[PDB]
């Protein structure tokens, strides 16, 4: 069967699930001729046929919650036929990241504390992540007030709840303050001139994060959805693109030199704050008219510093998701490794120094300005863990800049 794919009430094409379950996609010819025309994904170029590549299934799989458990709930709740994208999306495929809406071929402080109400890993991999669907909820709000949409009508915010405690075989990660954590890290990033979304803590104590793939009407009358996709979708994937593939890609951005500078800069930021979740899945581009693209703001940023020590883990356990140089251990990594990487990438040595130098200069006052602007409510263990472990790696920049 078929799902008609829309982007902002404009018709893009159709997704077909064939008899053997294969997913295929075909652009409408009034899409390929609109002034709005762009690919649905850079992995699905504008073209004329039925597209039958794995890129199609992946694309649409990448729109759904990663977790096989959040997938069961949707299955149970909406009586879905399976956990295949077509089947799960014929049920929840209205609001998703970026702009695509899929159609079958045919509120109250206490209900809130209420609306947000729902772990064990097999793997020894120190997953410290705020990108999970299992804590999220897209609300809508321009007033003073939260409210559930419904219909075809976009959300403005993603609300994140605490992760809580996580047990893998060999460690227990306490992420019960992941809300305060992400909040800190997002202000830090802003202080250091990284583009990141605006967030507030709301109160249960959750993160309200303003969506950067939503924008009001010029006439200010309709929330539009901005096309964007993540790097998994971009590359046709469910391995995993590192710094080199992404940096190559970003040479084609419409803001190539800025996006390439920011992206490298962000590898240094994640090193400094102990962020170990910067997988491909976690960077995104805006798709623009014509299928040109720009990096979005960076998002879903959490330090692993607050889970170091005690019931928690060691610093020698923290690995960058995308390594340098090959080099992944955050506590073995010095300015020199960033420069070896910039060199291998034919990213200008001078731009790498500039980045390393501004962090040298700026880290102390950024940390201090962030500290000043925290709520009075804020958990001091969180600040103390991040600040102290940041200043420590930063002193590796001083020994140098």
């Amino acid at each position: 069967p078929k799902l008609v794919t829309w982007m902002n009430n404009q018709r893009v094409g159709e997704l077909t699930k064939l008899a053997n379950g294969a997913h295929t996609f075909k652009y409408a010819p009034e899409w390929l001729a609109s002034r709005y025309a762009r690919p649905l994904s850079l992995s699905l170029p504008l073209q004329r046929g039925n597209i039958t590549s794995d890129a199609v299934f992946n694309f649409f799989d990448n729109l759904l919650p990663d977790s096989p458990i959040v997938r069961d709930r949707i299955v149970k709740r909406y009586h879905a036929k399976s956990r295949q994208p077509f089947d799960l999306l014929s049920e929840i495929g209205r609001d998703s990241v970026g702009a695509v809406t899929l159609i079958p071929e045919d509120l109250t402080e206490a209900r809130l504390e209420e609306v947000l109400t729902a772990m064990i890993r097999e793997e020894n991999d120190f997953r410290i992540s705020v990108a999970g669907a299992q804590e999220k909820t897209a609300l809508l709000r321009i007033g003073n007030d939260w409210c559930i949409p419904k219909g075809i009508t976009p959300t403005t915010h993603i609300i994140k709840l605490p992760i809580g405690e996580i047990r893998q075989p060999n460690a227990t990660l306490d992420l019960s303050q992941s809300v305060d954590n992400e909040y800190y890290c997002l202000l830090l990033a802003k202080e250091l001139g990284l583009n990141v979304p605006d967030a507030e803590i709301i109160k249960v104590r959750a993160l309200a994060v303003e969506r950067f793939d939503r924008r009001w009407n010029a006439e200010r009358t309709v929330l539009l959805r901005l096309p964007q996709e993540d790097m998994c979708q971009t590359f046709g994937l469910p391995g995993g693109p590192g710094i080199a593939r992404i940096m190559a890609f970003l040479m084609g951005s419409s803001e190539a030199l800025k996006d390439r500078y920011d992206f490298m800069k962000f590898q240094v930021f994640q090193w400094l704050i102990g962020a170990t979740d910067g997988h491909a899945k976690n960077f995104s581009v805006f798709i623009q008219a014509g299928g040109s693209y720009r990096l979005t703001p960076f998002y879903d940023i959490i330090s692993a510093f607050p889970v170091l020590g005690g019931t928690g883990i060691h610093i020698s356990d923290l690995k960058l998701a995308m390594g340098l140089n090959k080099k992944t251990a955050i506590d073995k990594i010095y300015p020199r490794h960033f420069l070896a990487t910039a060199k291998v990438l034919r990213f200008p040595e001078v731009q790498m120094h500039e980045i390393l130098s501004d962090f040298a200069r700026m880290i102390p006052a950024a940390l201090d300005n962030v500290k000043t602007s925290l709520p009075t409510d804020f958990p001091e263990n969180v600040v103390t863990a991040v600040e102290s472990n940041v200043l420590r790696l930063h002193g590796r920049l001083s020994r140098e800049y």
């Binding site: 902002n8 390929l32 170029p45 084609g252 951005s253 419409s254 190539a256 014509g290």
Partner: protein, 71 residues
């Protein structure tokens, strides 16, 4: 309209091919190069020379220019 990589360019030109429903060999034959070459371009645009690019571009009856909607 504005284009910033070899892949974006390849894609836009593949689509122009198609909309005139020409085929890779109709093209290759129009200019005198083997159809592989056109295929190698549409699929792997990065290492195409500029000489070859301007041939395919002549085939499609296009030129190119240099440059400096609510969503």
């Amino acid at each position: 309209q504005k284009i910033y990589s070899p892949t974006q360019l390849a894609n836009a030109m593949k689509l122009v091919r198609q909309q005139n429903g020409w085929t890779q060999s109709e093209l290759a034959k129009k200019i005198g190069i083997k159809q592989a070459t056109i295929s190698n371009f549409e699929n792997n645009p990065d290492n195409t020379t500029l000489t070859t690019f301007f041939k395919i571009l002549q085939s499609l009856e296009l030129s190119m220019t240099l440059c400096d909607l609510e969503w």
